[PDB]
Amino acid sequence: MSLVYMNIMMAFTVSLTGLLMYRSHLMSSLLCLEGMMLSLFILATLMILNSHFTLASMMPIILLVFAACEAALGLSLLVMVSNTYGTDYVQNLNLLQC
Amino acid sequence: LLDLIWLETILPKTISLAQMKMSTTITSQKGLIKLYFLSFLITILISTTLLNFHE
Amino acid sequence: PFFDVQKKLGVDLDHWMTIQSAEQPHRIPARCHAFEKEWIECAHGIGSIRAE
Amino acid sequence: MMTGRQARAPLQFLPDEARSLPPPKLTDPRLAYIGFLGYCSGLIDNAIRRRPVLSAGLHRQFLYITSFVFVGYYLLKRQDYMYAVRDHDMFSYIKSHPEDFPEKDKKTYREVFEEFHPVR
Amino acid sequence: MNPIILIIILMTVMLGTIIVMISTHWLLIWIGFEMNMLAIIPIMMKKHNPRATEASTKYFLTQSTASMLLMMAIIINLMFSGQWTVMKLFNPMASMLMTMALAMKLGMAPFHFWVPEVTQGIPLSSGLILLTWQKLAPMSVLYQILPSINLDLILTLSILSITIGGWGGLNQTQLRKIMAYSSIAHMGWMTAVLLYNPTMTLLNLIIYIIMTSTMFTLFMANSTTTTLSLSHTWNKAPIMTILVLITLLSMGGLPPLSGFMPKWMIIQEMTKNDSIILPTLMAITALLNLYFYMRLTYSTALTMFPSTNNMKMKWQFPTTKRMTLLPTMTVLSTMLLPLTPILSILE
Amino acid sequence: DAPEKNYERTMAILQIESEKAELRLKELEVRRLMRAKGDGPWFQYPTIDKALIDHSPKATPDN
Amino acid sequence: MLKYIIPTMMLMPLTWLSKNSMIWINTTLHSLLISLTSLLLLNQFGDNSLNFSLTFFSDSLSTPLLILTMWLLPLMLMASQHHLSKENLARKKLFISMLILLQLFLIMTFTATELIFFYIMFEATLVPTLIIITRWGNQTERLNAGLYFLFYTLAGSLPLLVALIYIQNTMGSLNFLILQYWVQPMPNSWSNTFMWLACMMAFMVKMPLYGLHLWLPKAHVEAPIAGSMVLAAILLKLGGYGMMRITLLLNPITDFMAYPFIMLSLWGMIMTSSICLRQTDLKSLIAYSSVSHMALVIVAILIQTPWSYMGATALMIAHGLTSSMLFCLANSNYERVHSRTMILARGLQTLLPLMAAWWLLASLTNLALPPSINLIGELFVVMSTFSWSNITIILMGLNMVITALYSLYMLITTQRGKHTHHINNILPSFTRENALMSLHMLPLLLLSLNPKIILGPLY
Amino acid sequence: RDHWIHVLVPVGFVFGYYLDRKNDEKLAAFRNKSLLYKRELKPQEEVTWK
Amino acid sequence: AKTLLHQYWDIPEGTECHRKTYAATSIGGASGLVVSAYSVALKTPTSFLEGVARTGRYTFTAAAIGAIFGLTSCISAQVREKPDDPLNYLIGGCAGGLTLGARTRSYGIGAAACAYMGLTAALVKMGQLEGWKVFAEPKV
């Protein structure tokens, strides 16, 4: 298939493996999650514009909006973590081992 | 020797110690979100490259 | 559980965006309108096992 | 399994052809067991709230019995309907495909050789 | 929380799951999962302590990752099929990604690592919602895509879930983690029979929801979250020890109880398909689940652990908690096996 | 009971149970054939409804 | 069989609506009435079993076990009402309800026409027995004994579940009456080898097989007296009943699958009997003797000759009555000295002469004194195993030495010698206790007058 | 009745016995139809067993 | 890793010993790499060197189990002249169990791994013989 889809899928996998390998910050995790969403937006958009499927042109906007609301919720969770420990470090979130 | 030790050793005590040991391996996690998602990425890589669950 | 509420009540919640060959605004066809119409009219009703 | 059968008429608890079937009796032992489950629910409801178990709230116990018999009657109707649909589809498929279901020639034991295994 | 806001948020959780159940477009499937997650996050942060925020953060990260993999599976389906019907998928890569995403949502092993944490971090009512209501929407999507699910993947996930949920509960004393590893094992049992007979998948889901709702309702009615506080129940309410006894013996699947009903039916559908090793090893692995159930019954019903003196004060007060449907759920989770051919209503 | 009663009651039992066993064997064979061929009413997994297709004259003719 | 199921279920409102001083008398009376009614099952024929319905049937194998089961409930109520006298009233009713529920599960375990219903009842009998052991047992090790009793049984029985569902899918049915006529020969393959193991190992655990018997000298010992009575007298015999039902389907592979297990019993009954020579615990001695007696039943079912099945079912009924009486004698001394150590209370014939006469009679039935049905079952098994292989008489006859040598040692250590000086709470024999001993021993002696009712479907 | 508890188990026998007789009429497909026991009915006889 | 098991099972029993040994060694090495990957995933090693030491130790342990398993299986199938026989895999599985006990430096783990892994390898041989399916295809 087309050549641009290779790069958009590879971008989704790069943002996947960034989201699946945390370093320290939860904000960097949320950025990798939104990179995954952005690559999904681009890939859906290039397909729907290519196929001239008219009714799905409203589809990526929807894919934006919900997920950005999702991002808002994630930011709020991070802030609550930051209001407990002072930092958004993922190693502070280890109390549920016992 | 037999009906207090060895017939007691081979079927119930070895199985009970094995399930105890596997239970202590599974639940010895450090609560780190980093390690669980790193295991998820290793899972996806083993599933695609090593187990071929996408073919 | 596919509780088919849309066919039960006769409402159309999401069938319109489902396929490319559906009713489009300003009668804009998809680039693969004819192929998708032929595949759907082939595979209609006979089930997925026979449709493959 | 039968999900393509109940897909042209979806979300119908009892279809119209279910009215061709004999409904379960009110003295159905399955329905009497469901009424016994209602009575047990009434006794457990008195026990968990520390009421006298057999005496307190007979109206509540009777509504437990009535509600379980009421729901279980329709559940038994749908049960009998789904097994009727199962057998109807089976027999129509055996009738429409004779080449897959031939009549096996049944041989009497005068021809049928069985190997004797002596127990000694 | 404002009770009106609690009602609207629980109706939004239910609305998300119902939108997953009734929709014919994959975008509305993804929307129902997003609405479900977005609305269930305040249910987990109901008490506002750092364990609830940690649990909600872990829950958000796992469900968000699964939602992104779900949308990538949907988008690859749109690549290779040009449409959006919620039916079989038209690519084994999209099928693998959707099966992984739904395994992450259900918390099936090896994506199980959030389930005993999050259930520990949240209250008993929100844990009840997470272990009963949050299974319904991904099992509906798995119900509708089973002509495309890889057999080796779904059975690998099933046996890995059953074994890890068996060994995980043996080391626990916290009741919520016990119910979470019980969840992982039972989801393994549900997905092991999915490609063979999905009516038995629905049967196992319904009997599991009934038994889990009974055990969480007993834990809420007795206000016990640990084994050793559950062992004070005989000196406070002796009927509840009988109820946790019969319900835990049901959840292990001992006949003549109704929790023997699903797994037996599952074996009844796995030997028709010439699989004998797999349901036998599954049934032998479920003895571990029954072992820590028996541990809880020995702590609670069949012995009497020592109590404290202040228990004598609680003798003067009856339970004012609304024990909603507890006799009904207790009767249904124990005495339903003579009505086993009722399962045809799920066909 | 009489030996006649036990005898013929046994014969009724054997008829009912042998009929049920033959029906279970036919049920297994029917399930195997319908899953393999997809031509019966069972295992009818859904496809797209062709009543969703617009057949109107579109904006461009080559379709 | 519904004329026995419904009275057994009506024992539940009979015990939950009785007055607080009346729950032993009413249950004892009406369970004796059910046991009197149990004799109608002796309408047996030389060719046809008594086939009640699609669900229940009773041949001459299930019938003596049914009579023994329905007779054992009043005797358990008499044995268990003393040590539960200070028990709470509702827990007393829960104990009686578990015994009633166990009788209910057993009487439709033995009459189950279809084998998966046999399996459901057969494994339903675990739960009241488990609850009785772990709730009304006396010591700390009742919990571990309940775990062993549960988890040897389920590890045996879940492959039986898989194998019975396989027979259901292959033969089309699990009706035993259908499978008498549709049974296909089982050839030599590894698939049929594990078919045989899955069909047999559950009953091997429940008999118990030697090497798998480890649950029993805990579960029979840590239980209360009604638990030990129902475990020894009935619940071991579910294994032999299920073997005699299931080895119809396992021919001719059984003729070379039986060889290890036959060894495991023919040596194992030498071992456990030898173990009874050095048991300091009297109740454990009776437990190991139960293993020793059921090993002969295992051999007799595996060699599958008519004399062997007749001796096996005679020995099952005889051992039910004998081991139940032996546990009741051990409890009658435990209720006095409060220790199960056999060397503690000695010389009891000087103090309790009639109870020592009961000890003598139960010892003589334990060592298979003719013409008791213990000797009838013992002897027919020895005849059939001699016809199997002539050398086995050595392992039979040596067994019959050691079986005497622990039976009279149990008689000599407890009843004979000088009485213990520092023990002074040795009350005279209560009328309930002697009634219990007679209600065990007198049917066991009257069955020698007409033993043909306890000789199975092929007498 | 002052001793109504002593009829729970006996009537539970009789009722159970009744159901067994009621069961036998549902298993009468081969009544007087077996090859071993079939015969002609006597006068003032409508069934060969009940 | 489906092709690894194919190139194991394509060779007949007791015919080509070193290629069978290399195929079973590769299967053991793949299993050791999977166990090592989850081991350094869920339990963080204190260094890169300790992590690669754990990885090399587990990979060589399971590779030695597979090597001595396939070697002992093929040598027994050669010297007993019976290729279709599960006693050969019982011997090979006990040799692999003794290999696991030698790597764990203990006798009782070696005897337990002998018994259980030998019975498991015998079951795998019987499943190849009679066609037992663990992931059986949905047919009804």
Give F4-61 as a DSSP string: HHHHHHHHHHHHHHHHHHHHHHHHHHHHHHHHHH--SSTT------GGG---S--SSS
d(CA H36, CA H38): 6
Residue F4 to residue H30, Cβ atoms within 8 A: no
d(CA E265, CA E203): 9
Question: With breaks defined as C to next N over 2.5 Å, after which residues does chain F break?
Answer: none
Q: Is chain B in touch with chain C: ≥3 Cβ pairs within 8 A?
A: no
Any chain D CB within 8 A of the CB of G97? no
Cα distances from A6 to residues A39, A64, E61, E75, E97, in angstroms, run 11, 22, 26, 14, 17
Residue G212 to residue B8, Cβ atoms within 8 A: no
d(CA E41, CA E13): 10
Cα distances from E61 to residues A30, A77, G156, G338, G449, in angstroms, run 9, 10, 43, 62, 79
Write the residue in D114, D115, D119 that is nearest to G255 by C-beta.
D119
Cα distances from F63 to residues C24, C37, C43, G160, G371, in angstroms, run 14, 10, 19, 63, 100
Residue F28 to residue I138, Cβ atoms within 8 A: no
d(CA E31, CA E19): 8
Give me the domain span that covers residue H38.
1-50
Which residues have CB under 8 Å from E346's CB, separation 6+?
A: E199, E202, E203, E206
In a domain, D112, yes or no: no
Which residues have CB under 8 Å from A56's CB, separation 6+?
A: A44, A48, C17, E78, E84
**Cβ count within 10 A of residue I113:** 23
CB contacts of E28 in chain C (<8 Å) are 13-14
Backbone angles phi, psi at E85, to 5 degrees: -75, 135
Report residue E234 CA to chain centroid gap: 27
Any chain C CB within 8 A of the CB of A62? no
Tell me, what DSSP letter sits at residue C27?
G
**Cβ count within 10 A of residue D19:** 10
C-alpha closest to that of B35 among A20, A17, E104, E120: A20
Cα distances from G213 to residues B11, G216, G290, G291, H27, in angstroms, run 11, 6, 10, 7, 44
Structure token pair of residue G58? 């009773």
d(CA E269, CA E200): 8
d(CA D36, CA E79): 56
Any chain E CB within 8 A of the CB of I127? yes
d(CA E269, CA E197): 7
Give chain H's domain count.
Answer: 1
Give chain D's domain count.
Answer: 1
Asked if G116 and G108 count as a contact pair (C-beta separation under 8 A), the reply is no
For G392-449, the DSSP string reads: HHHHHHHHHHHHHHHHHHHHHHHHSSSPPSS----PPPPHHHHHHHHHHHHHHHHTTT
The helix/strand/coil state of E83 is: strand
d(CA C51, CA F37): 11
Residue C18 to residue E24, Cβ atoms within 8 A: yes
Give me the amino acid identity at A65.
V
Residue A51 to residue C17, Cβ atoms within 8 A: no
d(CA D79, CA E199): 13
Diameter of chain H measured on Cα atoms: 54
Pick the residue of E25, E194, E272, E347 with the most F CBs within 10 A to test the interface with F by mutation: E272
Experimental method: cryo-EM
From E217's Cα to the closest Cα of chain C, the distance in A is: 26
Which residues have CB under 8 Å from I50's CB, separation 6+?
A: none
d(CA E287, CA B16): 12
Residue H27 to residue G53, Cβ atoms within 8 A: yes
Asked if I139 and F35 count as a contact pair (C-beta separation under 8 A), the reply is yes
Pick the residue of H2, H3, H8 with the most G CBs within 10 A to test the interface with G by mutation: H8
From F61's Cα to the closest Cα of chain I, the distance in A is: 46
d(CA E346, CA E344): 5
Taking each helix axis from N to C terminus, what angle separates G282-303 and G392-415, rounded to the nearest 10 degrees? 160
Q: Which helix (H) or strand (E) holds A73?
A: helix A59-85
Any chain D CB within 8 A of the CB of G141? no
The partner residues of C49 in beta bridges, in order of sequence, read none
The helix/strand/coil state of G125 is: coil
Sign of CA dihedral E185, E128, G151, G5: negative
C-alpha closest to that of B11 among G218, G215, G290: G215
d(CA G236, CA G327): 15
The helix/strand/coil state of G341 is: strand
Residue of B nearest to G275 (CA): B3
CB contacts of B2 in chain G (<8 Å) are 271
Cα distances from E242 to residues C17, E246, E333, in angstroms, run 54, 6, 13
C-alpha closest to that of G160 among G262, G71, G243, G279: G243
In a domain, D107, yes or no: no
d(CA H3, CA G456): 41
Report residue G292 CA to chain centroid gap: 13
Give me the amino acid identity at G262.
I
CB contacts of D117 in chain G (<8 Å) are 185, 251-252, 255
Q: Which helix (H) or strand (E) holds G58?
A: strand G57-58
CB contacts of B36 in chain I (<8 Å) are 42
Residue of E nearest to I139 (CA): E273
Any chain I CB within 8 A of the CB of G188? no
Any chain G CB within 8 A of the CB of F16? yes
Structure token pair of residue E236? 């406070």
Please write down the HEC assignment for all residues of G127-157. HHHHHHHHHHCCCCCHHHHHHHHHHHHHHHH
d(CA G190, CA G196): 10
Taking each helix axis from N to C terminus, what angle separates G62-80 and G237-246, rounded to the nearest 10 degrees? 170
Asked if E221 and E144 count as a contact pair (C-beta separation under 8 A), the reply is no
Give me the domain span that covers residue D60.
1-97
Report residue G24 CA to chain centroid gap: 24
Write the residue in A20, A23, A96 that is nearest to B41 by C-beta.
A20
d(CA G188, CA G194): 11
The structure tokens 């587990």 sit at I58
Q: Is chain A in touch with chain H: ≥3 Cβ pairs within 8 A?
A: no
Given the DSSP bridges, would you call strands G50-51 and G57-58 parallel, antiparallel or unpaired?
antiparallel
The partner residues of G56 in beta bridges, in order of sequence, read G112
d(CA D75, CA D66): 14
Q: Which helix (H) or strand (E) holds G50?
A: strand G50-51
Which residues have CB under 8 Å from G173's CB, separation 6+?
A: F17, F18, F20, F21, F24, G114, G179, G182
d(CA E300, CA E231): 4
The helix/strand/coil state of G290 is: helix
Residue G179: Cβ-neighbour burial (10 angstroms; 0-12, 13-18, 19+): buried
The helix/strand/coil state of D52 is: coil
In a domain, D31, yes or no: yes
Residue H34 to residue F7, Cβ atoms within 8 A: yes
Opening angle at CA A34, ends E87 and E143, nearest 5: 20
Opening angle at CA E310, ends E304 and E316, nearest 5: 95
Residue B7 to residue G214, Cβ atoms within 8 A: yes
Residue G445: Cβ-neighbour burial (10 angstroms; 0-12, 13-18, 19+): middle
Give me the amino acid identity at G207.
M
CB contacts of I139 in chain F (<8 Å) are 32, 35-36
Write the residue in G251, G305, G387 that is nearest to D117 by C-beta.
G251
From C30's Cα to the closest Cα of chain E, the distance in A is: 10
Q: Where are the alpha helices (DSSP H) in E82-197?
A: 92-106, 115-121, 124-132, 136-144, 151-168, 175-192
d(CA B27, CA B19): 12
**Cβ count within 10 A of residue B8:** 14
Taking each helix axis from N to C terminus, what angle separates G306-337 and G237-246, rounded to the nearest 10 degrees? 170
The partner residues of G51 in beta bridges, in order of sequence, read G57
Structure token pair of residue B42? 């290793």
d(CA G132, CA G225): 10
d(CA G115, CA C47): 39
Residue E64 to residue A43, Cβ atoms within 8 A: no
Residue of I nearest to G193 (CA): I126
Which residues have CB under 8 Å from E236's CB, separation 6+?
A: E222, E311, E314, E315
Residue G423: Cβ-neighbour burial (10 angstroms; 0-12, 13-18, 19+): middle
Asked if G267 and G213 count as a contact pair (C-beta separation under 8 A), the reply is no
If phi > 0 it is left, if psi is from -120 to 50 it is alpha, else beta; for residue E89 that is: beta
Asked if G198 and G159 count as a contact pair (C-beta separation under 8 A), the reply is yes
From C9's Cα to the closest Cα of chain D, the distance in A is: 10
CB contacts of A19 in chain E (<8 Å) are 65, 68
d(CA F41, CA D8): 11
Any chain C CB within 8 A of the CB of E280? no
Taking each helix axis from N to C terminus, what angle separates G2-16 and H8-24, rounded to the nearest 10 degrees? 160
Residue of F nearest to I139 (CA): F32
Structure token pair of residue H17? 């016995």
d(CA E167, CA E161): 10
Pick the residue of H2, H6, H9, H23 with the most G CBs within 10 A to test the interface with G by mutation: H9
The partner residues of C19 in beta bridges, in order of sequence, read E83
Any chain C CB within 8 A of the CB of A53? yes
Residue G214 to residue B2, Cβ atoms within 8 A: no
d(CA E303, CA G254): 44
Residue D4 to residue C47, Cβ atoms within 8 A: yes
Resolution (A): 2.6
C-alpha closest to that of B30 among E165, E117, I52: E117
CB contacts of C1 in chain D (<8 Å) are none
Residue F38 to residue C18, Cβ atoms within 8 A: no
d(CA G230, CA G345): 26
Asked if E186 and E163 count as a contact pair (C-beta separation under 8 A), the reply is no
Residue E318: Cβ-neighbour burial (10 angstroms; 0-12, 13-18, 19+): exposed
Q: Which of residues 12-31 of F touch E (CB under 8 A)?
A: 28, 31
Q: Which helix (H) or strand (E) holds G57?
A: strand G57-58
Structure token pair of residue A54? 């008219």
Structure token pair of residue E69? 């993999």
First to last CA, chain E: 40
- Could you give the domains of chain A? 1-86 (1.10.287.3510)
Cα distances from G336 to residues G279, G409, G429, H49, in angstroms, run 20, 21, 10, 58
Spell out the domain ranges in chain E.
1-347
For G312-328, the DSSP string reads: HHHHHHHHHHHHHHHHH
CB contacts of B8 in chain G (<8 Å) are 214
Residue C48 to residue E86, Cβ atoms within 8 A: no
d(CA G56, CA G105): 13
Opening angle at CA E197, ends E193 and E203, nearest 5: 80
Residue H8 to residue G37, Cβ atoms within 8 A: no
C-alpha closest to that of E82 among G107, G423, G13, C34: C34
The partner residues of E85 in beta bridges, in order of sequence, read E25
Report residue G112 CA to chain centroid gap: 18
Which residues have CB under 8 Å from E321's CB, separation 6+?
A: E220, E221
C-alpha closest to that of D68 among C35, E325, E267: E325
Residue of C nearest to D4 (CA): C47
Structure token pair of residue G18? 């009785």
Residue E150 to residue B44, Cβ atoms within 8 A: no
The helix/strand/coil state of D115 is: coil
d(CA E3, CA E127): 19
Asked if C15 and D18 count as a contact pair (C-beta separation under 8 A), the reply is no
The structure tokens 């066609």 sit at I131
Structure token pair of residue G342? 């056999």
d(CA G389, CA E221): 65
Residue of D nearest to G385 (CA): D120
